[PDB]
Write a protein that binds this ligand. Structure first.
Ligand SMILES: O[C@@H]1[C@@H](O)[C@@H](O)OC[C@H]1O
Ligand SMILES: O[C@@H]1[C@@H](O)[C@@H](O)OC[C@H]1O
Ligand SMILES: O[C@@H]1[C@@H](O)[C@@H](O)OC[C@H]1O
Ligand SMILES: O[C@@H]1[C@@H](O)[C@@H](O)OC[C@H]1O
Ligand SMILES: O=C([O-])C(=O)[O-]
Ligand SMILES: O=C([O-])C(=O)[O-]
Ligand SMILES: O=C([O-])C(=O)[O-]
Ligand SMILES: O=C([O-])C(=O)[O-]
Ligand SMILES: [Cl-]
Ligand SMILES: [Cl-]
Ligand SMILES: [Cl-]
Ligand SMILES: [Cl-]
Ligand SMILES: [Mg+2]
Ligand SMILES: [Mg+2]
Ligand SMILES: [Mg+2]
Ligand SMILES: [Mg+2]
Ligand code: NA
Ligand code: NA
Ligand code: NA
Ligand code: NA
Lengths: 283, 283, 283, 283
């Protein structure tokens, strides 16, 4: 079963699929080993690892090559964040095939205008055209196109958010990712209740840690839950703490015992496989 | 004062310079903020972040571009690990100028043969030629060339290790990095005592957490101490733990409070600077 | 004298500076050897060499790395085509320092909106902000910022074209590149006559081969003439012809004599330098 | 029929397959349009386009990404030059899957030692192990592994050249590429006559333009003829000539008529396809 079939099977079966953010292949491997359903190739986490704002500063190829390296490391589906498609429908058309060829099983594209000005969203018809270009360019029909509706964030209201969602589904979107920045999950939950479309919803509840997977499973219309930036946050917290301890203690004497050993990193690099290759082919 | 002058000033002054491993620019920024003297652009940490063995599997350009991204983020000197120079003296000659142009203040090159066979080290004269090619290719004489002696690891003994160190210094090496895999730091300390050369020594005491910076400062001949892989180890430990907690709890309800906030990552991405640029130029 | 000083000296002296398009470093080296004043790092020629449309399909990093490779090969100034700045003023701010660090002595940025819709140009004030962000981000004040006015191409008329030119110069543009698609050079020449600003003009007269350098030197207000796509055209013509001859003749028997020899390519690769490095450092 | 099946079908059918060198996708497209059977992703042509010696100076990723861009442009098989495998059998194992995933239908790997010293070839058994690692790592059994024997160039004689060829075929090589630097094709033809193996031979007769395809078809044992560097030579000759004419004439007045038009380059960039995408999806 291909990774694309696996993703599709999850969406079609009604199971709740979980995806975790990853800013490099090692983190993606740890996510797979932890049991998540898929990897989220987050633009926010990649730009954060590079210490640059998440505002289309990183090159498209830096993200695309990272997607390729992650997909060649894990056996679970990869969902790629392609922001606004790096341009208009023509750019979308040329970019989607490269993400599919890099091994991603899905892309997430949002309806925000690019670049930011001093409208917040692109016209409904313009975005429908971008979604249609994405589904036209894919080679494997199992490849998934997810349209991200930013109407709530833009402060446009629930009625406009549902209208865009329905228009994107009409254009060929396989799932709709709806996002909220409200303090409470009231807004998001009201959208889910009102959602009239046939395709599944995708939530990124980073702003609402109180919404557990059990709470989300209770929402039959949601097919995917994404943990949007927890890997980079976990890494920053531990690195910052270990660096401060080394500088306070003037060394690694107290900190070494608590860290994973060098041998554990070498195993995560796939040393066992390398050992078999060396044993059978280094002659 | 340029980063290269800063590094040189540290070596020449007699202060003990500390450098921390970094596998991406964010980690490098956290190292700078923590107070380390320099960043170590570790090939072991970069290959580990890609989940591939540290055996010249990653492309030279993947490491070189990472060095460029780290140097454009931090204000402290960057020491680049270039393994065996990606070839012979001709390759060294073409590669060193690219690392210098990427912003690194020093390179570390070791005398192991490449690629591994089924001798362990290259001939003394061959390596002298590689060091000479490195110092000939550098543009800024302040740029530092560090020769890494692997004779102890190769099991060749102390006398051969000192002989190579002296031969590399004669060829132009600005510092000698000596490494041991022995369980106890006895071997390393005996080498330091016996070292007759004029240039400073560089230690990577990952195998001896008991050797503190105070213990190393007591070794007048050592000018640099490098923490070789603690960033990737710290990151792996926290990521693996947070991923397991999310999967055990079926969500981020218990884990979110402990993590650095999204706002802290956005500040680390340099949002303040981005805010000034937006305020003054988005019109 | 730095490449940036060289460019500046040309602009300030009143000499007419010539720049030739190059899609790779070899072509750039041939341009230098032929005697041109500078290299034009054409987005049209790079996208053509990749067989993709010149419509922001290539990644910014593919062009930036090509600029780096060209600047490390030639000793004459490189003028980089950065299209619309890969975004708004914030993107311009983050991108310009990378082009300067790659070795380019100037960038050319145009006032077209990106991406294309189904207004043609961005507002005058928005572009002024992008030019100001570019000149604020440069480190070396000798680095040159050239603003390309597309008002004539957009069919907006001469009065609006001059107004934008003056507004961009007010925002800090060091030169104004004005372009025409009219069949005859009447439109372009009328703009030059009317130009009231103090900075030099830049012409890309690809559409008017009848306008010679002597004709352009006669235009005191023009400081740079760029040959926009002749390298890729020359290469396509000869390659296509040699390929057809080989397939017609069933071999290279008739064609080999006319081609430059393998020895000539090896010299262009800088074999002599490589021979000195081998002789002095391979030991 | 996949590109790999197409290549295999050519080798198995007994037809003589022709492959032309290409240093970028545009040249590769022109080769396809001219009628060649396949593209040769020459390391010599790519390093020449970058104005650097063909001595493993370019990064492996620079060549691999170029292979990816060429394969996504042409519909005919691509044969990738991977030099000595970028290391030993372990490196070969990690590299081959990346070339296959980039779209190449075959790789060519030679038995020279890397890097050059002050033996010329690696031991027969070491190379057999590298070939075995290559055929073990490929996913599609149709993917072709070509072993290049440099024994004649090394001055080791015909008997040793045939012995290596047979040993590499025993290790799994699908074809043997044999090369000569002798002035006359006597040496090469004698090798072909003596060749006792079952797999086809591959010739790169750049040094013998007198050996036509008809002469090679007459050699039943040769299954592929590669034109090794004619694209870069043709391009250099025309570019150098057009640049000299522009500088002599002080303009493009005399040269423009002879060049392919801008409209022809735009068609080669695939503008027609872009026009359909714009018409159907830009809304
Ligand atoms: O080879 C893969 C292994 O590394 C892991 O990810 O589990 C599934 C496999 O297909
Ligand atoms: O701009 C730099 C700042 O970001 C930090 O790293 O401290 C020193 C500065 O030069
Ligand atoms: O080294 C350079 C040489 O290669 C050429 O381009 O002419 C000027 C020099 O600075
Ligand atoms: O789409 C391809 C076309 O562009 C050309 O190369 O011929 C064969 C096709 O498969
Ligand atoms: O980048 C992300 O993680 C996102 O878009 O949610
Ligand atoms: O890669 C490293 O960190 C090293 O070489 O010590
Ligand atoms: O790309 C070019 O050559 C241009 O913009 O003129
Ligand atoms: O690089 C080449 O073209 C070769 O190896 O023949
Ligand atoms: Cl990372
Ligand atoms: Cl990374
Ligand atoms: Cl090219
Ligand atoms: Cl190229
Ligand atoms: Mg994102
Ligand atoms: Mg290392
Ligand atoms: Mg352009
Ligand atoms: Mg080659
Ligand atoms: Na990263
Ligand atoms: Na990394
Ligand atoms: Na090119
Ligand atoms: Na090229």
């Amino acid at each position: 079963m291909t990774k694309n079939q696996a993703l599709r099977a999850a969406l079609d079966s009604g199971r709740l699929f979980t995806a975790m953010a990853a800013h490099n292949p090692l983190v993606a491997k740890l996510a797979e080993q932890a049991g998540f359903g898929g990897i989220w190739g987050s633009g926010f986490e990649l730009s954060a690892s590079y210490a640059v704002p998440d505002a289309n500063i990183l090159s498209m190829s830096t993200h695309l090559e990272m997607m390729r390296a992650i997909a060649s490391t894990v056996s679970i589906p990869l969902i790629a964040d392609i922001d606004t498609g790096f341009g208009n429908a023509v750019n979308v058309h040329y970019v989607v095939p490269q993400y599919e060829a890099a091994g991603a099983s899905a892309i997430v594209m949002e309806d925000k205008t690019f670049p930011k000005d001093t409208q917040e969203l692109v016209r409904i018809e313009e975005f429908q055209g971008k979604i249609a270009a994405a589904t036209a360019a894919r080679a494997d029909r199992d490849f998934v196109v997810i349209a991200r509706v930013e109407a709530l964030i833009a402060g446009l209201g629930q009625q406009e958010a549902v209208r865009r969602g329905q228009a994107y589904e009409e254009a060929g979107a396989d799932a709709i990712l709806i996002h909220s920045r409200q303090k409470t999950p009231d807004e998001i939950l009201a959208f889910v209740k009102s959602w009239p479309g046939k395709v599944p919803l995708v939530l990124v509840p980073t702003a609402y840690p109180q919404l557990t997977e059990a709470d989300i499973a209770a929402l039959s219309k949601v097919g995917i839950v994404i943990y949007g930036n927890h890997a980079i946050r976990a890494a920053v917290g531990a690195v910052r703490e270990v660096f401060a301890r080394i500088r306070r203690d003037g060394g690694i004497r107290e900190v070494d015992a608590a860290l994973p050993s060098v041998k554990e990193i070498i195993e995560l690099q796939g040393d066992e496989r390398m050992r078999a290759v060396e044993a059978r082919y280094l002659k």
